[PDB]
Amino acid sequence: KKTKGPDAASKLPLVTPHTQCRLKLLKLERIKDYLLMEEEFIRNQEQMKPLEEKQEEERSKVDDLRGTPMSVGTLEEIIDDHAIVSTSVGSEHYVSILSFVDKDLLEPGCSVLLNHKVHAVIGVLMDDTDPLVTVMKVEKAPQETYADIGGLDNQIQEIKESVELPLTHPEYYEEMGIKPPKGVILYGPPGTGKTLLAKAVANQTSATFLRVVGSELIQKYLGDGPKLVRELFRVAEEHAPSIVFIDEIDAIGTKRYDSNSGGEREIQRTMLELLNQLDGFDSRGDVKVIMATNRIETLDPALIRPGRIDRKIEFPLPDEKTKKRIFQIHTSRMTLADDVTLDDLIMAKDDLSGADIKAICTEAGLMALRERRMKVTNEDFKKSKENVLYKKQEGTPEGL
Amino acid sequence: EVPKEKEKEKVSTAVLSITAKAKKKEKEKEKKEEKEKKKEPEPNFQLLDNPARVM
Amino acid sequence: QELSEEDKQLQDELEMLVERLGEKDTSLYRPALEELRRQIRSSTTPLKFLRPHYGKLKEIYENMAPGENKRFAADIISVLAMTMSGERECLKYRLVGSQEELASWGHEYVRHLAGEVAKEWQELDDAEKVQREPLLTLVKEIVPYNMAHNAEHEACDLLMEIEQVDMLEKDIDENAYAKVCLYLTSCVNYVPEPENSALLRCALGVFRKFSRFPEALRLALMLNDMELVEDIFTSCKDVVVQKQMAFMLGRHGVFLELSEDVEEYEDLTEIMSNVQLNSNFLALARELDIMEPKVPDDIYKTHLSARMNLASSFVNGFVNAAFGQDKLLTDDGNKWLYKNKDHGMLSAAASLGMILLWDVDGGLTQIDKYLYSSEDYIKSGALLACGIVNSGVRNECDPALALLSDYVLHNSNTMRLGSIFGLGLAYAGSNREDVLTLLLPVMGDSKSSMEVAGVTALACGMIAVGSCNGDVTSTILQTIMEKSETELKDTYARWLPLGLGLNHLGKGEAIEAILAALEVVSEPFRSFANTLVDVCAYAGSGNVLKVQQLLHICSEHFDADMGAHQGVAVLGIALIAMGEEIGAEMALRTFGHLLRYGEPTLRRAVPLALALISVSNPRLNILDTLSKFSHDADPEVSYNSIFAMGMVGSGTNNARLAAMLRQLAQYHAKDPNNLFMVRLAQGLTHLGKGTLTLCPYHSDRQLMSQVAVAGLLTVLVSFLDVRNIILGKSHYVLYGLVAAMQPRMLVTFDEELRPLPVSVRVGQAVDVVGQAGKPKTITGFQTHTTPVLLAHGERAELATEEFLPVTPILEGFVILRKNPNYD
Ligand SMILES: Nc1ncnc2c1ncn2[C@@H]1O[C@H](COP(=O)(O)OP(=O)(O)O)[C@@H](O)[C@H]1O
């Protein structure tokens, strides 16, 4: 019922300075002038019409036969000449449309019009705007790019190779006749994991993306957690081949829980449906499933096997240079200071992750805005360290 | 008896900011590079032949 | 509201002070303001308290006796006006003020002062040049402050607002000049022409001062001033800068004609002539193992006819272009052309020359046998093959001129056509007086057909591109006048305006004289010709005014059918501002609305502009939109969409796009008209094995090479109406891609000019930090040996600080020298 959405927005995010300067001013003037010229173009084309030809052949033949009164009902079945439509209050009509028929946009389970009196379909509402049962493609192909995250070059190269084995050079193993949808099993500290998302946006630069986080220990009798994701990756194959990011459910939803029976039925269903979908002998498609976790220990032996789920990748903690790069990225938007106090905040620091880096950057601006408002607050040199302590790392009575 | 009709369908250009800045430069270059017959004489002093529809 | 206790106490204290300063007797006026100003200029290194005292402070400042008291009073009014500004009261008070050292009153004050100075400098009339000097002195005081406190980019903003980039040169030091110049270059893309040339000239001035000649040549090429290019080439003297200049001219394709008095002149003219281009390109292709001749059949994936075989030959030539290694047309080539039917032998031989392009020695010997062929089409194709071979690459003895001796003006139409097109491709950008004086008389011939005259105009335009050749234009106009209008405006006179546009490419302004001379022409062809020459001359400028004129004219009904010039307006829409990413992707969106609600001619021409925007750049949205519109009802619209996909994927080897074209081939297997050009699109995608890109934007994708865009535009002008012309005869116009076909890999030499195996890090290079004019940041270091295919979005960077390049721009050719700290 959903194929694509009109992407006529996000007007050139590449504003090079992202700070108020003449160059950025001039880029915006070119942006606005083009908007003015495009609007003037379309308005002049629609107003200074190519030709006046009667009632555009609309009101003469089709509009009158469509009629004034109408009602909307879903279209159920298709037959060679007629069409089988399930209208409101459970009515069912077998009529051939010939006025304003667009068979491609008609489709089963879509809203069509009924002209009353002689109830015959006369049109279709392609908008409809109610495909809301299971919605996971709403966040498809996220705009985040490689440049958003730095200092992770080894992992970026590894994931890029693992996901550019398809798309790029598919004939490579098409000739090798394997077509492996191995996916990637991602490790990493609990202080990260939404980077398991950030490193995923590198592949999200191509095709769409689906996310299943937390899901459930599929107590549902039908199960169909992984099975519905199988249907959605089939939908992804219908679309541009998407990836499935199941961070934290490859861990909990697929736990190496070591009891055998009487175990919430996910061990029976979820793990067994995961390896069926992860085996290329059952389902085709360029879909690559990114299984990311923060507990490598709970890797189920089915998930452990690289024979079906290959391309194990470990996410380590950032190094000194990586900490410098991520701090530079996060403070670039805020113009931390003119003294550039960069290395003092990370030189003695250890076990600091991306979420902590983002938090301390945000809190540095918050503390400055609190009362120390001084644009590039001269206090920021040490207040960045003041809010990098911020306690809140870990707290547990004494036991020492 | 005379319509005095005009079909324009003309809308003015909405040049606003930098096009208008060039227009200011265009201003910089462009700076150098029936009463006597209507007051008294209404046509009421005419002569008419003997066939004349007059109330 | 309850404020802070100490804050309220200080507020009351300042209230008492301002009341004292507002008292009647002035004997206490001075001490009150002495006390006040010290804490006024305290927080900047307060202003909240004096918010409601605007009128009282204005009265005190006006009432202050002239002298010290008045000018401190004007000082305080100025530093407070940054908050209480209904106008530039800060600057009016400061002009009345002391004009002593201002920079100590806080960074916020000096920057508000700088902005207000820029406003007044723009506001003051021409007759007012009294206060301009004090504002300039204030500017020359704040620029060092900006340089010290990393505010050089807004310092550049105010200096360009006041048109004082000349003293920007003298003030800027090299320690921060690189980012300032990058900021200038970025502003160049959007500034209109007069200040655009001004910023280009100042950028040349900075780089000449700081001995930054390699990037200065890049900027000179942007300025398209060959005189300044020669001047700066003379200015630089070192052997390393001399030889990198010669690479840059050779990579651009324009030959610089100089004297042998310079050192190592033989190598300089050789590397400018691209003699070693072919040898290096084959050597790198062998090193990548990408040399095997890829069959058009297994490109087609035939696991599941004369024109179709012709398309197969053309795509085979596209794939094996610049290689010269293809036995399909070499061993049994004579059998293939004999088996070929009708008009295609000329194109098959030209395709063989495409295989042998840039291969002068090998190509000439392997085409000499086919030169003496029996069929006129094969002979003409062989001559065109010779011109393709010598195209782009320059030669000392220039064999093309002597080889095309009788065929240049030969009576046979096909033989003359092949020679003329060959000479045009050869002398493209040479601007040679002898070639011009030999081909323009051929232009003046009356026995040649209308399309032959058009091809002569095309050859003259591509030879004299961006030269404003007056005699070429006069001959063009005279030939148009002599030809009768009725037979002029049929289907083929569309090459004469193209030659005019090429000859005045990138110049503008003077086009008024050409269009005024052309005004005598009747509307159906004049309205097309003047628009074409205008958009070609103003290409790469971003003229929103010109494009909205094109938008207005294509908005007309135009329904003998003069509405053809709506198409060239569509091409002009993309052509004017294809330079940077902005101006191309909203132009793309404009094309989408054109297709969304547009005339049949408009939607016929839109895919051409779509391909022009992003040739050789496989943008996902472009590929999707073109694929969705490839199945439109209008056959010509489908043809343009097919070719647009081929062009945007040209020289990319994009696997998913190739799969889409294969699906299109299955879709269009029933109709050969779409089928053979879908094959053509696939051959374009795999052209040169993807080694040579087709985008005319080189030198970090920001320089317009006139010859390449000339050949590309000629192809798109042909593809305005291929529904008539490719079906009929124009199987030769497709060979204009030689100009746009340039390699996109890195060839590293050394000071002794030997191929270095130095490895570099290659990956996506997009802006991360925009705080200033920082260099573009690269991510994804997939480092390997130096032959690396440079596509859009991604750049290259040296792996280590061990080999210093002649220029930081890393594409095409580059010399790497050992760093003094290399160890
Ligand atoms: N190395 C990095 N560079 C840039 N941004 C990062 C980096 N690491 C994390 N981030 C950003 O910080 C956010 C939190 O990252 P992460 O540590 O993955 O979250 P969590 O710890 O909640 O899983 C992410 O959304 C990501 O965009």
- Rounded to a whole number of angstroms, the distance from the CA of B21 to the nearest CA of chain A is 12
Instruction: Say how many Å lie between the CA of residue A252 and the centre of ligand 1.
Output: 21
Residues C635/C647, Cβ–Cβ less than 8 Å: no
Instruction: Say how many Å lie between the CA of residue A354 and the centre of ligand 1.
Output: 4
Q: Are strands A83-87 and A91-95 parallel, antiparallel or unpaired?
A: antiparallel
The neighbour count for residue C229, using CB atoms within 10 Å, is 22
The answer to whether the Cα torsion of C349, C355, C361, C366 is positive or negative is negative
Strand pairing partners for A123?
A113
Residues of A in contact with B11 (CB under 8 A): 43, 47
Minimum CA distance residue for ligand 1 atom 22: A194
Q: Are strands A288-292 and A184-186 parallel, antiparallel or unpaired?
A: parallel
DSSP A32-51: HHHHHHHHHHHHHHHHS-S-
| Spatial CA neighbour of C687 closest among C615, C771, C774, C610 | C615
- C743 phi/psi in degrees, rounded to 5: -65, 150
**C373 exposed, middle or buried (CB, 10 Å; 0-12, 13-18, 19+)?**
middle
What is the atom index within ligand 1 of the atom nearest the CA of A247? 23
Strand pairing partners for C749?
C815
Going from the C-alpha of A201 to that of each of A109, A147, C289, the distances in angstroms are 34, 10, 33
What is the DSSP-derived secondary structure letter of residue A317? P
Instruction: Say how many Å lie between the CA of residue A194 and the centre of ligand 1.
Output: 5
Residues C660/C627, Cβ–Cβ less than 8 Å: yes
Going from the C-alpha of A155 to that of each of A241, A317, A346, C794, the distances in angstroms are 22, 12, 22, 18
What is the DSSP-derived secondary structure letter of residue C349? H
**Nearest-angstrom CA–CA distance, A243 and C811:** 34
* Residues, chain B: 55
CB-based contact A48 B9, cutoff 8 Å:
yes
The answer to whether the Cα torsion of A294, A297, A300, A303 is positive or negative is positive
SS3 A142: coil
Q: Which structural technique was applied?
A: cryo-EM
Q: Where are the extended beta strands (E) located within C38-124?
A: none
Cα A271 versus chain centre, distance: 24
Instruction: Say how many Å lie between the CA of residue A193 and the centre of ligand 1.
Output: 7
SS3 A207: coil
DSSP A246-313: -TTTTTTTT------SSSTTHHHHHHHHHHHHHSTTT--SS-EEEEE-S-STT--HHHH-TTTS--EE
| Spatial CA neighbour of C70 closest among C97, C91, C90 | C97
Residues in the annotated binding site of A: 188-195
What is the atom index within ligand 1 of the atom nearest the CA of A194? 18
CB-based contact C156 A145, cutoff 8 Å:
no
Count Cβ–Cβ pairs < 8 Å, chain A vs chain B.
16
| Spatial CA neighbour of C192 closest among C697, C588, C545, C574 | C545
Resolution (A): 3.6
Residue entry with tokens 């999200």: A204
**Nearest-angstrom CA–CA distance, C564 and C560:** 10
Question: Which string of b and e fits C481-507 if b means at least 16 CB within 10 Å?
Answer: eebeeeebbeebbbbbbbbbbbbbbbb
What is the DSSP-derived secondary structure letter of residue C765? B
Minimum CA distance residue for ligand 1 atom 7: A354
**Nearest-angstrom CA–CA distance, C753 and C814:** 10
Residues C574/C590, Cβ–Cβ less than 8 Å: no
What is the atom index within ligand 1 of the atom nearest the CA of A358? 12
SS3 C805: strand
**Nearest-angstrom CA–CA distance, C503 and C509:** 14
Going from the C-alpha of C419 to that of each of C322, C386, C401, C499, the distances in angstroms are 20, 9, 10, 18
The answer to whether the Cα torsion of C459, C461, C463, C469 is positive or negative is positive
DSSP C655-705: HHHHHHHHHHHHHTSS-HHHHHHHHHHHHHHTGGGG-EE--SEETTTTEE-
The chain B residues in contact with chain A (CB within 8 A) are 9, 11, 13-19
**Nearest-angstrom CA–CA distance, A77 and A107:** 8
Going from the C-alpha of B3 to that of each of A27, B6, B7, the distances in angstroms are 50, 9, 12
Say yes or no: C544 contacts chain B, CB-CB below 8 A: yes
Find the helix or strand (DSSP H, E) in which C798 lies. strand C794-798
**Nearest-angstrom CA–CA distance, C140 and C158:** 11
Question: Which string of b and e fits C292-307 if b means at least 16 CB within 10 Å?
Answer: eebebeebbeeeeeeb
- Rounded to a whole number of angstroms, the distance from the CA of A363 to the nearest CA of chain C is 20
Residues C345/C377, Cβ–Cβ less than 8 Å: yes
Q: Name the residue of chain B whose CA is nearest to C549's CA.
A: B13
Tokens of C302: 């035939």
**Nearest-angstrom CA–CA distance, C724 and C491:** 9
CB-based contact C126 B19, cutoff 8 Å:
no
The answer to whether the Cα torsion of A361, A366, A369, A370 is positive or negative is negative
Residue entry with tokens 């990225």: A329
Strand pairing partners for A92?
A86
Of A36, A40, A47, the CB nearest to B9: A47
**A222 exposed, middle or buried (CB, 10 Å; 0-12, 13-18, 19+)?**
exposed
- C644 phi/psi in degrees, rounded to 5: -65, -40
Residues C254/C739, Cβ–Cβ less than 8 Å: no
| Spatial CA neighbour of A123 closest among A105, A101, A104 | A101
* Ligand 1 mutation pick, A145, A153, A186, A195, max ligand atoms within 8 A of CB: A195
Question: Which string of b and e fits C135-144 if b means at least 16 CB within 10 Å?
Answer: bbebbeebbe
Tokens of C716: 């798109």
Instruction: Say how many Å lie between the CA of residue A356 and the centre of ligand 1.
Output: 8
Of A14, A34, A169, the CB nearest to C581: A14
